[PDB]
Point group: C5
Chain length 400, copies 5
């Protein structure tokens, strides 16, 4: 329009985009900085970066970009692209993107009284400490630090407005507790100008249904299945294979969780120590199986059962476990000849009776170690799982 063209010609006359738009050069410029969270795109534990979709909000006043709306009836708002007017050089301090600035340079909305409005969008990548001590029952506090790179406090003082969460798109994995901000001042030793900056702390809680279904319950079931070696009879000849196969499956499950864990050496993860305890339990079960197999295949005349072992296992353990114990010249030549066979059969019977005791002792040890290992596994799993804080909150929210 005629009035629009005339005003656009008038405004850019003698305008210097390198100048701070203030009436008094000795006074700072009040700039209001805010934020508008849209969605949490990705949280990467290994690289320790956070990716979010954010609309920034910067607002200030311009002394030169003013006009009387009566002389320009139709026009009430003008718009300028990047590079034609002065804008704050607000940057994200802790950035992980290749190019240090990720915002998209849109237009600037200027009212009739000299009020500007800049809302650039972008996909921001920032580096924050992602603790994995209580994984998967985690709560993370990631920070976003914004501030003017070059303008100090005598020139541009930053003010904070509350972050806008309306329009947030919920994430499937993470639950947003909140996002509170804070305006802080820095005092350089040179001078006496406060340096205002705005920091936003995004606090989120992981939803643990997926991990509980895919990593914890299957490992619990595999460890419980590993307990069956103490129920298999020793004559089957399959006791070792079960345990070693369970150990191999545990190694595979270990690599599965290792490929998603950061290499940080700050603390021992809950899942890591839980896997370690389960693996130790399986190994001890394998050792006990080896000992039981040694007891079962004992040589009948390779030694005598120790008195201490007898009084420990055969009677006391049976009492505790309620396991009952199991169980004419030719005439003389013919006589000696059949007596030899009778004595041989008697010796064989005695040897078998001796071996039965060793077999019973092996069975008793098997049952006792089954009981002990089941108790140990239950106690260790319950304690390790319950040690984590907000575990009750996590289970109540996710699984119910």
């Amino acid at each position: 329009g005629e009035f629009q063209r005339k005003l656009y010609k008038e405004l850019v006359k003698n305008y210097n985009p390198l100048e701070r738009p203030v009436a008094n050069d000795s006074q700072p410029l009040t700039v209001y900085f805010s934020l508008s969270l849209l969605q949490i795109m990705d949280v990467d534990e290994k690289n320790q970066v956070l990716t979010t979709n954010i609309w920034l909000q910067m607002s200030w006043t311009d002394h030169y970009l003013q006009w009387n709306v009566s002389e320009y009836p139709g026009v009430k708002t003008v718009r300028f692209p990047d590079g034609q007017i002065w804008k704050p050089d607000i940057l994200l301090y802790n950035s992980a993107d290749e190019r240090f600035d990720a915002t998209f340079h849109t237009n600037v909305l200027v009212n009739s009284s000299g009020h500007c409005q800049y809302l650039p969008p972008g996909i921001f990548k920032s580096s924050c400490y992602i603790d994995v001590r209580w994984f998967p029952f985690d709560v993370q506090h990631c920070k976003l630090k914004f501030g003017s790179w070059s303008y100090g406090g005598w020139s541009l003082d930053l003010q904070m407005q509350e972050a806008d969460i309306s329009g947030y798109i919920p994430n499937g994995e993470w639950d947003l507790v909140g996002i509170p901000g804070k305006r802080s001042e820095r005092f350089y030793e040179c001078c006496k100008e406060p340096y205002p900056d705005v920091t936003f702390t995004v606090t989120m809680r992981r939803r643990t249904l997926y991990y509980g279904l895919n990593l914890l319950i299957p490992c619990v079931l595999i460890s419980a299945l590993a307990l069956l070696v103490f129920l298999l009879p020793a004559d089957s000849g399959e006791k070792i294979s079960l345990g070693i196969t369970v150990l191999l499956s545990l190694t595979v499950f270990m690599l599965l969780v290792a490929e998603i864990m950061p290499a940080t050496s700050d603390s021992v993860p809950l899942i890591a120590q839980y896997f370690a305890s389960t693996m130790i339990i399986v190994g001890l079960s394998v050792v006990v199986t080896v000992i039981v197999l040694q007891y079962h295949h004992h040589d009948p005349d390779g030694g005598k059962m120790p008195k201490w072992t007898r009084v420990i296992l055969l009677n006391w353990c049976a009492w505790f476990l309620r396991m009952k114990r199991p169980g004419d010249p030719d005439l003389a030549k013919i006589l000696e000849e059949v007596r030899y066979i009778a004595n041989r059969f008697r010796c064989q019977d005695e040897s078998e009776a001796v071996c039965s005791e060793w077999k019973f002792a092996a069975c008793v040890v098997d049952r006792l170690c089954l009981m002990a290992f089941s108790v140990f596994t239950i106690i260790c799993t319950i304690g390790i799982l319950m040690s984590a804080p907000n575990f009750v909150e996590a289970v109540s929210k996710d699984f119910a």
Copy 2:
């Protein structure tokens, strides 16, 4: 051409690219927006990102770019590159790309009466919610929200037009259902002026032939082969090995499944329920195998058959499945010896009879659990696969 040179010189006289080209500055400017779907490239379920290839279509009227073809006999249309003509700042809010705007800036073609056309191509990466509750039989809706950034409702009247799919290239994995649009007006915390936008919803259906033939049929076959542990005679020593190797195969199959799905905690996937059911069935089969093996190797003279187990197994169950049960001092001394031998043989005979009874009981239990597990597996698989909606239509389209 001389006419082209003269018209190009005239058209840029006192032309401001920052000015909105309207005759009356109080009236809005009508802009028509539409899409042109060319190809669906990627549907990343893990990252919830959709990649498409579309041509945006924008049309409006420029008041200043008008001329009479009588004075310029040859030229009818003109083309202006980026930076020399006014263009709407329409961009995608759902953008998941590093650079927020992913369009290729091309020329703007203009009428002899001021009608401008703008068809910029580009590959768009948006973020839409992907539902995995019914994978691989899911239907996905993904939204694309287009609208002007710094221009309010009182400046441009964004008018929606029906999307064009006349040049769509069919995808081998996703079947397009449609792409309708809706134009709505929203308020924002920034300002006090409504901001219109145009949203297009892309509806796709996943073809299930590949996922079926590569995921479900092998699982069915392996789970069915796991049932062979009940037909294997206990005299062999490979039942436990069979069970554990099937468990390992299912574990690797589950890992391959888990490495393609998002880590959401909003629902339990159908494939996850199926895999859990199969794992539970195989685990209980292994437990039953352990029980049967312990029954078969039951040492005689170490406990009699309980009456309850006797009546349940050897009397009732064997009836049910129509399986039957299997089936002079020298002479005095010599007589004593042969009597001893005969008595020992008689005791051996009664012991082996008891052993045969125990083995028959083990076989009966094996047959019972074979039948029960077969019924359980069939029912569970059928129910889990038929629970999902549109399963019949998916099967029909992808197979028949």
Copy 3:
């Protein structure tokens, strides 16, 4: 030199890079387009993306860039960079790159009579449909569509020239068959003027030596190894272990090859059919092994075979396979004892004979199943491999 400087000053004056350089504005401008294929960089079957290194060849005539070499004795040609002279806006329609244009903008060489020559290079990524029906004996055709974006038929008369492959560098995996071109003009829903375009179809054949030696021969050899389970004597309890280990290895093989193929549900690939048939063969071998083991470990005095089973196995099939089937009162008291012992031995001998007859029946079944499975494996492999077209050509051109 002075003459070159003067000519450069003269040519630039009054020139407009926006106008179309034609003497008559009502006549179209003839532009010749051609390709120069240099290398095929990658064929991504997963993303259906083809990467090539080519040089575009564009040539036209400029009316305003003309001079007489007599007035400028030294200079014969001039070079203008991007943005200083008019250039056609020819770009690839079906681009798969984030930047829709991937051409390095070079200088434009100009005649002394107005002929312009443009040779921009670039690394082009194109989205072409890849058919995996006959993988790895398939032949692929990928299209490259070029044409002006904003210039219609009445303004820019595009023409086609045959592609140049004199500088082609052979690829290790893909063998080039040819690259023809076709020029056509279409109508678009935007406008009512035809828009011509030039399409180049790249036809190439996949070399099969690597895929053969790394996918087909190992599978054949391992299937033949799985066929060896029928020669194992039943006493050595390793048949189940052999079969299940082969099945596990082959599931691993199938799941590994599944990663280098698209998830298109358009057809069942040749390799998929091959591995499915091998799966069924090995599973049926395992089932047969279970049946044979069940027959071998039969319970004596548990029900004799049916006469039908006897005549089928030990009579007909044994002859068919040419197998030979194997095979004073004290005096009275001691007489009774010895008679009892002898009768017990006789009963033991009868039971042994029955067990041996069962074992021979099991061996006969084993031999029959070995023969049948060998025949089936050979037939299935040969049929599946020979069903694919171009198999003979691929073999005779790669292996021979």
Copy 4:
């Protein structure tokens, strides 16, 4: 303000950004260069690339950018963007990014007496040698070489200032030791003028808690578990299965470690030596198990124990490891028959005695090899682990 506007207009009058701001041309321009390390983002061992977040600090004196504060009461400092004033072209020589420069060009702050400050941020990828000889117990030094490109020693006088680490953010995986700098000038084949440069050496130490808990301890546990093969009785058939499964479980660990580490062929890594030692130990254990099994299943009547073997094993070893050592006409015909039966029984008893002697020899060999293998494993593990120069430091810092 009016004063700011006038000063900005005055300062850029007759200014030339291509000119070096020195009052006297024959003298160099002193520039002070320093660093500001924020955090260490990534250390890629396979690609040998270090990624850091740093701020450069360059300060120099400009002769033309001076003004009197009394004439401009408000403004005390001015700021300029890129292109409008002269800046040093200081680059990182050993860059690894696709773009050779990764800094983000910010504004330049100027005194009222002409003192320019430049603090451009960026994320820098630099290629530095990575030593994996003592991995994980290793300390790495990575160089960062900065310096002007086209300015020599007679034009630019680079001066080094100590690096700042007050803003450092500790990294979990790596522990920073220090960052000293060094300034030196070199000669290049291009030119006959020295070119000074500043090199900062970042020295960091790897924290070994994660690797210790995830890599070494499981390997020690599985290696110790492999020693159980010498305690199993030879009657069972699981020794070879145990050994080979342990070998597989170690092979996959070696696979993962080789995946983690680079393919440099300048030294044998400590973890590689450890894995080779474990491989050799397990293989030798399997060979010993095979030998012991061959000794156990010795055919009686098919050979005799050599005198050397007898004296070596059955006496000296049995003392050393303290193992007990286990071990009328009709009348004549009847007499002959019973004599035959008893004679065959005697022969069977002699064969059984020979078998028992062979079994005892096998047990003695098993025990001796268990002792020897335990000693070898412990000695080798301690020797390999203790050779790291900073093993004591790692143990006393991370674990303690």
Copy 5:
């Protein structure tokens, strides 16, 4: 400085960056081109690309950029940025980067007599044919072609200077043999002007310590381990498991080796044929083990030993292998009943002999096939390893 200010003002007056700075327009401009290699960043056999860090050296003479030093006493050099003076358009013909040009545009140094220097850095990703025929023992020649894109022989005379490697940083995997270069001319049919181009060939040698320690040694060790099945007694029942385990292990070796290699069909790699030979040897060992198990478990009544098998195995191979071959009415009724038992025992003793013969034959076969396979594996491995050229060179330079 005032002098350099006025010199910069004077030099750019009436300067056109579009023309060749030659005093005579008809005389070609001589340009000297060289290269300075610094690092071999990466070699990608799968993608057939080479990544290097390189400085380019271009030198020419500018006619218009001359001045008298006595007129400007303090100025001896001037520096110009991109787009301000004429520069050769030298490009890399066979680049593989997404952007065809991968150099960083630095300043151009001009001396007082018009001599220009240009040293742009960059990381170049070119494509070269990598031959994996003799992997790991490889020697690769990768080409780098540089030339002017749009300048002929009457315009540019591209001379050559030898490459500079004084600043080369040794790589940990590749040994730089050298970098020769050639200056080649191209003659066109149109014109008699040569078309100079400079190509540099990079000759590299792969250091084989890492590959020979991570691929060769474990393969030969596992292959030697696979020979223990013949030393294993057949009563253990684990030969099949050992063989099948080892085979399956070696597949997870061949597949993971093929993971890192290009899919070319130009030749069969040495590592591929070595792996194939090893797998074939293991498979034949498994078949022989099956045959030996068939011979061992031969029932005594299932036929008679073939005469040829007798004379061969029991005599010839036995002597050759030096294996020792092992080795009133009541009276009548009692007489018959004892003679029956005596005859039963006699028949059992007679039937044991043929079983012993079969077992001895199986042992002979085991020993003979162990002897054969031991030489087979050694011959195959040595021949395959020593077939490659410069294997002695690689060994002497890496291991020794």
